[PDB]
Enzyme design. Structure first.
Site, PDB file in Angstrom:
ATOM      1  N   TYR A  27       0.767  -1.230   0.000  1.00 49.98           N
ATOM      2  CA  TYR A  27       0.000   0.000   0.000  1.00 49.98           C
ATOM      3  C   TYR A  27       0.806   1.293   0.000  1.00 49.98           C
ATOM      4  O   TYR A  27       0.182   2.308  -0.316  1.00 49.98           O
ATOM      5  CB  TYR A  27      -0.976   0.018   1.238  1.00 49.98           C
ATOM      6  N   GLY A  29       2.338   3.525  -1.771  1.00 53.74           N
ATOM      7  CA  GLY A  29       2.495   3.847  -3.166  1.00 53.74           C
ATOM      8  C   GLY A  29       1.104   4.120  -3.716  1.00 53.74           C
ATOM      9  O   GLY A  29       0.148   4.152  -2.935  1.00 53.74           O
ATOM     10  N   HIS A  47      -4.472   5.559   5.074  1.00 52.38           N
ATOM     11  CA  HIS A  47      -4.428   6.812   4.330  1.00 52.38           C
ATOM     12  C   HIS A  47      -5.197   6.690   3.016  1.00 52.38           C
ATOM     13  O   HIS A  47      -5.891   7.642   2.625  1.00 52.38           O
ATOM     14  CB  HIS A  47      -2.941   7.198   4.075  1.00 52.38           C
ATOM     15  N   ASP A  48      -5.062   5.552   2.299  1.00 52.71           N
ATOM     16  CA  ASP A  48      -5.846   5.248   1.085  1.00 52.71           C
ATOM     17  C   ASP A  48      -7.333   5.199   1.336  1.00 52.71           C
ATOM     18  O   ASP A  48      -8.112   5.774   0.569  1.00 52.71           O
ATOM     19  CB  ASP A  48      -5.479   3.897   0.491  1.00 52.71           C
ATOM     20  N   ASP A  89      -3.837  13.305   5.710  1.00 50.54           N
ATOM     21  CA  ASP A  89      -2.387  13.457   5.579  1.00 50.54           C
ATOM     22  C   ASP A  89      -1.673  13.579   6.907  1.00 50.54           C
ATOM     23  O   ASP A  89      -0.626  12.977   7.097  1.00 50.54           O
ATOM     24  CB  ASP A  89      -2.090  14.703   4.696  1.00 50.54           C
TER      25      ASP A  89
HETATM   26  C1  LIG Z   1      -2.247   7.555   1.135  1.00 49.64           C
HETATM   27  C2  LIG Z   1      -0.762   7.175   1.097  1.00 49.64           C
HETATM   28  O1  LIG Z   1      -0.208   6.960   2.174  1.00 49.64           O
HETATM   29  C3  LIG Z   1       0.005   7.095  -0.064  1.00 49.64           C
HETATM   30  C4  LIG Z   1       1.371   6.879  -0.007  1.00 49.64           C
HETATM   31  C5  LIG Z   1       2.142   7.003  -1.144  1.00 49.64           C
HETATM   32  C6  LIG Z   1       1.577   7.345  -2.371  1.00 49.64           C
HETATM   33 BR1  LIG Z   1       2.667   7.609  -3.905  1.00 49.64          BR
HETATM   34  C7  LIG Z   1       0.212   7.556  -2.426  1.00 49.64           C
HETATM   35  C8  LIG Z   1      -0.558   7.429  -1.284  1.00 49.64           C
HETATM   36 CA   LIG Z   2      -1.505   3.139  -1.696  1.00 51.96          CA
END
Ligand SMILES: *CC(=O)c1ccc(Br)cc1
Ligand SMILES: [Ca+2]
Length: 124
Positions: A27, A29, A47-48, A89
């Site tokens: 996750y 990324g 976070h996603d 965030d």
């Molecule tokens: C939501 C989150 O933590 C996350 C981390 C890295 C990337 Br690229 C996108 C989202």
């Molecule tokens: Ca992700």
């Protein structure tokens, strides 16, 4: 915005998001599938899910407001939706900081898709 999420990771976790959290586990990324592999990966999963629940504005592009006060990041502004993005965030930045004891890029960087089976995707 994503630039602000990088900024909060640098402020809180004293690490770059792009260098340490852009391709870690299932996750950390863009997108993701499978099980959160460890505590840092679960911070990205949450976070996603948090971003997925934002209705009314865009977590990538929209700019939120915040101030540093009482030893914390305080999300503000006059827009409830943009403040929701900031909260997603901020929580992830603190989650990264708090799980640095466990961070292990040797084991989890570019973990690979087979290792993150579509069928093991934990729901939000
Ligand atoms: C939501 C989150 O933590 C996350 C981390 C890295 C990337 Br690229 C996108 C989202
Ligand atoms: Ca992700």
């Amino acid at each position: 915005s994503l630039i602000q999420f990088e900024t909060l990771i640098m402020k809180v976790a004293k690490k770059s998001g792009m260098f340490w959290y852009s391709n870690y586990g299932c996750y950390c990324g863009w997108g993701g599938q499978g099980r959160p592999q460890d505590a840092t990966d679960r911070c990205c999963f949450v976070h996603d899910c948090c971003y997925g629940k934002v209705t009314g504005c865009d977590p990538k592009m929209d700019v939120y407001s915040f101030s540093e006060e009482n030893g914390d990041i305080v999300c503000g502004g006059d827009d409830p939706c943009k403040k929701e993005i900031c909260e997603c965030d901020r929580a992830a930045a603190i989650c990264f900081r708090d799980n640095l004891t466990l961070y292990n890029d040797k084991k989890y960087w570019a973990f690979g898709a087979k290792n993150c089976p579509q069928e093991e995707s934990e729901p939000c």
